[PDB]
Design a protein around this nucleic acid. Sequence first.
RNA 1: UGAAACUCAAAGGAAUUGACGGGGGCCCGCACAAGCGGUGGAGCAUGUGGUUUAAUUCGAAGCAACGCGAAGAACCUUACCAGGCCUUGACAUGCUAGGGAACCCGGGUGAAAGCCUGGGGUGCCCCGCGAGGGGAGCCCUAGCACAGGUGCUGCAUGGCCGUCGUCAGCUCGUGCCGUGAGGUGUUGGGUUAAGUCCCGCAACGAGCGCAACCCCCGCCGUUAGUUGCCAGCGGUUCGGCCGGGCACUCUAACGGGACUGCCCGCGAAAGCGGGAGGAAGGAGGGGACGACGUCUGGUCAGCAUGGCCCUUACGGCCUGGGCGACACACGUGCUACAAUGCCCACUACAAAGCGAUGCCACCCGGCAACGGGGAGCUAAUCGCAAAAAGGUGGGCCCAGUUCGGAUUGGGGUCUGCAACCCGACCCCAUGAAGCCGGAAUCGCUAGUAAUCGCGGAUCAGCCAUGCCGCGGUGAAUACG
RNA 2: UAGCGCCGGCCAACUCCGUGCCAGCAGCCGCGGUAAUACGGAGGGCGCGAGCGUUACCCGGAUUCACUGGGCGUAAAGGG
Lengths: 261, 206, 60
Amino acid sequence: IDTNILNRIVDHAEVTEKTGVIEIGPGIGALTEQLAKRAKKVVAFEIDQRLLPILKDTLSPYENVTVIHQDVLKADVKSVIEEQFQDCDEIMVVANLPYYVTTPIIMKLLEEHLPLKGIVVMLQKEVAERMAADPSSKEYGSLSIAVQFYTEAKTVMIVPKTVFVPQPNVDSAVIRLILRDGPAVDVENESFFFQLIKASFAQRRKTLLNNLVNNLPEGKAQKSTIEQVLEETNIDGKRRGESLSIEEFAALSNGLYKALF
Amino acid sequence: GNKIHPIGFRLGITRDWESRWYAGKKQYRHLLLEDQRIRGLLEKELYSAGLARVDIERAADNVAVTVHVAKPGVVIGRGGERIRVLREELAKLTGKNVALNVQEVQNPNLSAPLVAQRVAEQIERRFAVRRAIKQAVQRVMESGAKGAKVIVSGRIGGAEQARTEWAAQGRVPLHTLRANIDYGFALARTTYGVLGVKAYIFLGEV
Amino acid sequence: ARKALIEKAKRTPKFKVRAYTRCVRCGRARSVYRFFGLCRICLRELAHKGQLPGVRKASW
RNA sequence: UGAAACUCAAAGGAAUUGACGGGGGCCCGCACAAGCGGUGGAGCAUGUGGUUUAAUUCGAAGCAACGCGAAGAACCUUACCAGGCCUUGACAUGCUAGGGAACCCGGGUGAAAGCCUGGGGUGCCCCGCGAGGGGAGCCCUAGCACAGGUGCUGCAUGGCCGUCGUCAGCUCGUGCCGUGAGGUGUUGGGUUAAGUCCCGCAACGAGCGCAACCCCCGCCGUUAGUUGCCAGCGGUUCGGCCGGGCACUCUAACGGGACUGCCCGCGAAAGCGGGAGGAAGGAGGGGACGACGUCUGGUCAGCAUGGCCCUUACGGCCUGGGCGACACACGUGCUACAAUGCCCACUACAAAGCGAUGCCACCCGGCAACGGGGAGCUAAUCGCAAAAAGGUGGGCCCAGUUCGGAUUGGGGUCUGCAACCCGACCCCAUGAAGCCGGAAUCGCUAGUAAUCGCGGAUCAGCCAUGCCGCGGUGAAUACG
RNA sequence: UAGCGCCGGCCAACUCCGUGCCAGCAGCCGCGGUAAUACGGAGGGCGCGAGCGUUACCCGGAUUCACUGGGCGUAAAGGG
Ligand SMILES: [Zn+2]
């Protein structure tokens, strides 16, 4: 059942008669109807051939709707924005993502540096604290780092399991990401920074030093280097890694790359 | 059975002619023929726009075409390019410098032709007929409309045998003159033949 | 109402008394009316549509 | 008294909704009855079945096909047949090779279509130096996606129509009754054109239907007075013709009026029987208006349309024929069989329509159909237009006849390129069957039946005695 | 070393080809003639697992011999 939940999602996304929105996986167009009613020109990236007639029929009485037959991942959305939202001020993203391609979608959208105002999505609670957490939260990880680096994010709505027509298996949480003008911390070696983040969380039980040394091809070579760098940066490798933050990671990354990159 | 056209029944009272012009016996047929040509052209052209009605008027070698459309945005476009070229085309059809006008219908749920067209589109999109009719009737009834009724002809869902579906709600008094009943017919061309969608909307009295 | 026959009655048939009239809407040659140029069926259809000005159902 | 072996997945009881009955009750409709005209008998017109033919193109099949599709078949229509001919084609949007651009025009062929051709070329748009010049502008001529099909299925369909039937029915919401399917309402009494109303009653309402809302006619107001009208007056060629008025009729807009509204009796009420008043009295007369549905109802030949099929022929032009045959048989009509009549002269009284490739006043020629001249009318003005039955006067005198007008011979007019198959009309001869029609059977309840004319659509003309309308005179009967 | 049965309702487990009242399946109800979740095979799923199914016999479900715990107006059953 989706009667008022959609309205609340749109309210939290804060759309108006001048804001542009992006829809992924519209299906029937439950959210699309409300978005057309409230917002300015919309856009959709449906890929399912079977549901296309139903979406067309749903959006027949609307004139501010554009439908695209491209996959979000494959399509370069920069041209999409420059073509469609040619007059609009703020371009937001609202969608219900289908479980599997939910993290890839977010990552692809964020890694392309869009002029998007922000994002409001509906996904599972499972991976919801995993992308909005804090030091020693038991949900801290690589996903959390990526999301809380690229943008500013916090969970907004907790849609319980007992709302849908066919009872799903997982509770859902609508999350709102306000995009950040400039990256939180400055890293020259961004790629190896990300690999460092994933290395510190390869196994969440081991200590940070052991994580860092055991996850690099050069880890064996630069054991002493790793140890000295973690010691000097006032954030030692004797901790687990879940107790660190963006700032400690930035300092450590600087320590590694200023000296070995 | 064999009901008569609800519009032709009420032409004098509670309805008005789509064509409003006078001509002697000499020139009646020519004017009517060019009128039919104009109607055909506009039916072909402005389909996607949500056309409901075409009105034609004549004063003195002058034509005043008026088109009722759900979405005039489609008709006009950017800087009135489409409307301008459409005026050019119509004038090229008949050397009388036609003065095209476009009106937006308030609440396109209250236009029988539009409802019939939408249901026909749904049928052509291989929708379930019964659900479509029920939803259409409910949609019309939500927008005032003291009565509504929708009929689909036959040959439902590629079945060998044809059958009428039928669904009404409220008052549809086809026998009373002061009824102001709006009527709309649409033909749905499907891979398994043709379907006829009729819509009656009882919108007030007198 | 073969397309050939319709396209043939639109010329000068070498004589005046060879020409005839057809319904301008459906090409019927049977029961057309001079005033309208329509067959009986097209006349009824267009009269019901309300597309014929001042043409109404009679009852005296 | 009383088994079994073998077989079936049922066999049964009560009740519900329908369908049916050589069950019943009540009610209705020209259904019958009481009347008035017919049909079936004769001639002819027309539509069919058969038969014939090269073809006699097809579809319609009790009511509900059969003067039906067809509100116009000599060519055309035309879809059929015999011949002469064309194959991006009568018709559309394109693709690709140069002739090459458009248009005008003349001969052979000839039944016409088509073919072969010979000429003035109808060229600029850029105006590169302007003389070839590449271009849009048209046009042919081949190569190809495509045309096209009245070719088949109405038993794949849409739309539209017929029919039961303008019959009075078909259902739903909430409530209540039942374990439940379901019932109630919607049954009962009365009344009505009607499920139209009243009463009774666990039902109370509603929707689609009935009714009313719309149109015409019947009475009267206002607004308006020309092309319509003329009471009073003044002219007057006697003509509403003139000046006048617009009173009256009328024309066309808007309203009024009729609702058992008012008295008398009766009934619980719906309502019933009388009575004023009123133009109209209880639905005032007529029309439009056709429920859920039934009929594998009708139409692929009005149109659209899914499937199948043909695409040097199942497509397309042209000439001629055919749809008009004829040992027969059915349906719908027209004229008659006579004296309440038939013929001939004079004189009257309508309505609704139609007309500028038309209506055609008047005059002249012909006995006429018509022809020549010729006005007036895009229309309350001009014309079609003679209304006929009727009323007067004269004739006929019961005879297959001054009845009836088929058939045939001979002249002639008009339309049309053409009138033989196969048009209409005028004139002179010819003068048939028919003396009121067996069994059976049709229509009609009032301005109706019967009878008499007039107009219109289609249409060059007409095989229209058909269809749709308009007025004149105007019966009988209905106990049940 | 991983097999065995089932996937129309009972009853947990769904699609694609093959076939066209044939080959077959079947404990009951039944499924098979052109779009088969019911036959054959594949992919996938479900149950159990050194086991999994089938046949035979006994008790249950069977208040279906009713002591617990049934009935006999019309269903079988009141004696003439
Ligand atoms: Zn027609």
